[model samples]
Target: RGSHMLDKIVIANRGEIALRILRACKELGIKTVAVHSSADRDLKHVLLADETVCIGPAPSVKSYLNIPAIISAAEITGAVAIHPGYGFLSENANFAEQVERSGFIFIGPKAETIRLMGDKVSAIAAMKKAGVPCVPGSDGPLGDDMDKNRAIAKRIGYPVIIKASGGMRVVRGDAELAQSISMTRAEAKAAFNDMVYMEKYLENPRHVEIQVLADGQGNAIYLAERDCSMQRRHQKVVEEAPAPGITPELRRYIGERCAKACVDIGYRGAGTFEFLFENGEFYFIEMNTRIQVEHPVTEMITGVDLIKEQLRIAAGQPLSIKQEEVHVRGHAVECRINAEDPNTFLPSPGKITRFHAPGGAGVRWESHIYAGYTVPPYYDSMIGKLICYGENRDVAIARMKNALQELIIDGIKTNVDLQIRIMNDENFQHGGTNIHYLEKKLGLQ
Candidate 1:
């Protein structure tokens, strides 16, 4: 509180989240170097930062995600830290190490933490070892033999799903496993892809993530959970916290387990434990070793600024709050506003004619879009996040409903209507919806 903790921060990502991190840096009075590609030269955040650098051309590989170029920019700008905002190099452990080697802070989890928690089996087993649930799955890819695949599935137990890279159904036994494998292989071959992956799947599981924070000094804690169940084609449309239908008992248990996981893995800075919940049992999906898109919902409920915490941790500061001192105060929700046609869900790349975001005491509208800003087709479609907070979940929902009405983005189609319908839907109103519920409801599958 006395003075700035970091010198200058380099933002190595683009679009709305880049703006989000940049704004956070500005609030802390830290100078920021905004790096971008030729396509992103005029991005709002780049314009606002203290300094701007063109790392590459329009294609992302030559630009935002180009590690060497980013590091060079950091050196040129004399930045003490680089914040990888969500996607791109955010979770790349190698990039973390590079930053460390270059004498700049990588404002996320440790590189080892990222490497250990990537694949299915290792993440799950390591989490289980730490007294947390990561996910249920086989150790690695099954052998080429059909019998081995069947054997592996049986050993992992029945009802485990199989896939090459996407979704699969559960198989009952050895015989069913073989049958399922053959069919799965045939399906993959039809798509001309390999059918070489499998994992244990939870029955009617709900997608939830536990927020965990850790400092360099072995201090770790959990901050409730978020329900990201409302997704369209694997992209989340709505997220809420603390997760609905999660009892305090289970929440506390998982939170403690995840904290232990942070300590077990030597986790540093902000991270998330993604899980699948079915029949009150929690299964780890994967560990996201960086700030997530739904972080604001957790922040609104827990009264913690995650970005600031990341900075503090990177600055060799111990966690400001102990685990017990942290408390969940209220409910919060975040809706992703993508620049796409509502009916087809396809990218709507064009100049915006109007931009009207909702506002209220308990509402927060985050967007980099302006009246003349054009929605580009080269990057992630998400352009805005509509967040709302209230003393209760119902109040949050009610506020979000009106907030959607107030949000007017003319000349571009968005899923605001879909989110509004979700707000009114019975499944969401009473909670207890599964991961596949939206897919089933929308007939996306």
Candidate 2:
């Protein structure tokens, strides 16, 4: 108990993330218990885990999200900790609290921290007080006067966004301000019955996030950042680390702010500070209290094993390295390969007829898929992550394109061709494309 190395952990999730965590636990010599729904019995992680438990049926509510079932599995397996790998109950405050109360470690931040950051208004306030820059907006509800609302918009600057309890609208100038507010509220009342607030509207902003690691000992460090602007319908299509055009000065400034915020909020384990970056300024969006899907990009650039670090931190160990020791070595890109139609984006799940992973220097494939493995229809469509690292961005992109082309998955509709097109996209190749760029290119918006 003095050394505090975890003996066993229950990966309270499934799919690629489960396999990712299982690999980390294996390296740390910690046994892993992969709990899954019945449909996920053939999942790669489930097959490789030290212990496997069937929690429930295909419906996520009865299995993945079933708190009692997950806890019961942990109890039966004698797991010392539970690692909720992204989504599901990863950020569920009640789940974390229950895990702790039941005398098992929750490999994440405290429940209070989760609840605190989950609330947007409170999270923005916390980050602002912790020296993190935020969007200028009014937290208070608006009054009926158009003149008063106009004044507030003027103070917050032009191009404001109005959000009602039920709907939202954006205003570019004073001409549409009054009508937009009325319409938003009208829709809000009709749809959900409530009010509205306002914030500065960033027309085009890149989705960038800073990754941080903290320990209960009050130590924290930020491992640079990732640019995930290549998105479709708000879902990331591709992500890269050390976001292009970000200088060392900017990286250090924002990294320090994020690390400081982590220490200030008593955050432990892995977390992300998502921000909207435009015109060289970062506006805090929200903090993800659990590991993210794009985490491999950060890992490839920083050479840090985030999952292993999460396990270590959950076991009562302080951060393994100091802030000064952390370094961003190279550029990395991760393309999410999903089992879906490239154009329509419909889920296509079936048995893999043939599977070939891209290899060679700098290419890393993270997946539990293989030939004959069936992708279940009940879970996320993302079948794998193809990450490539290089000493620079261009090299990384080249490697990614090559890897994408070399990859092959038969008997399943995949977005691989779309990914290939994106890799060769002019705007994508230019780097630093806004979040809407993908949708614009695909003519979806």
Candidate 3:
């Protein structure tokens, strides 16, 4: 193990994000090995990697989160580093420690940082020390007192967003769980960057996250804000930036504090400070410790490559830009295209008979599925993300709709109609939608 030698990297995950990480590694002149489950044998990234390893069967715990299998793959492939692309082992502290212990570099924060922040309680305590604000929840978790649960709800708002500061994990009790489908919890685990320790929620009832980059050299900066208000069944379908109605004064006011948080918490590499916004006020939520699914929106507006930056930072390079040097331009939006039924929300996985992502000026379509790609039912239903940008929000919305009309994935049923309806919805068109919008539409209200 030599310093700054990232000649080969192992992407220990699957789907679009794996492909995303692979491209970044390729650009950095690094060879890559992708680990996949049996079901994802023919996945785009699995085939694209210089080498590939079958970690386990379809179950994620035995595959993507299988620590030993992943490390062994890296070792055999001669990959010196493991890039645990988001949604699996990326936020797992033990997995990270195991990687480092096995003599492979884990391309993320140190094991302690992950352990400290991975726990909802300790992470919140650390943020409070970092001058990042919090809600009226326990400093961490408490015993299972039936009265304590109600007491917790009374002080903080009911069902307050109990967030993992450095990740997107959430905790719901009998009430929230019964309100949502089993898949909601499934989606939650897949969403956050999960856990026994507790933190609570607050709201503009809007989901807005600030992207930050840090190099272990003690340098950090906040890129900008993204509004991820459009979602269904607790899964995000659309995201945009810079969040509409956020004043420039407020943007910097919050941005600086978040960067300060990175410096204070000993956070390194790429991370995001998620927040709840309401009526011009903000509340800190969980933090995501890896590149986000909607990261392209930030890239479209800021002209920065977060994935490459993460790779560089992992190699011990300093952040190339300063907070003051950052500039957010125009507007951008993303639509998550999933293989599912439009009317009744369900996972639809199968072979793609035909496909074409509408491409033109101001549109970016990222798909791991081509015409013959067989989407395995053993994992997430989302097949791709469609991002569009314009000089303004209105133009961006228009481009997204126009692009979707031309976009086609013929075999498997897609939520394309659903996304189209969103772009045309009156409330969404004007930015009046909130966290409750989708539940109301789907009759879950």
User: Largest lDDT belongs to which candidate?
Assistant: 2
Error of 1 at 353 (Å): 0.4
Q: In angstroms, how far off is 270's CA in candidate 3?
A: 0.6
User: Which is superior by TM-score, 1 or 3?
Assistant: 1
Model 3, position 27: C-alpha lDDT score: 81
Residue ranges of candidate 3 with Cα displaced over 4 Å? 1-4, 137-204, 342-344
Cα-based lDDT at residue 430, candidate 1: 92
As a whole number from 0 to 100, the lDDT of residue 25 in candidate 2 is 84
Cα error, candidate 3, residue 415 (Å): 0.8
Question: Across residues 1-445, which tens digit of lDDT does each residue of candidate 3 receive?
Answer: 4434799999987888898898888887788888889888888877888988899999988898788999999888888888887888898889988999999889888888888777876877887788776655655544345366556655655454444333433434536522232333345457662332334544337888899998977899999999998877778889999998888889998888889988888789988888888766677768888778899999999999988888888888898898888999999999999998666667787889988879899998777888799888777888899999999999999999999999988889888988998899888888847887977776766
lDDT tens digits, residue span 235-263, model 2: 88899998999999999999999999999
TM-score per candidate, in order? 0.89, 0.95, 0.85
Ranked by lDDT, the better of candidates 1 and 3 is 1
> If ranked by lDDT, best first, what sequence of candidates would result?
2, 1, 3
> Candidate 1 residues 181-251, lDDT tens each?
77777787676565457777666788889999999688999999999988787878889999888888999
RMSD of each: 3.4, 2.0, 7.3
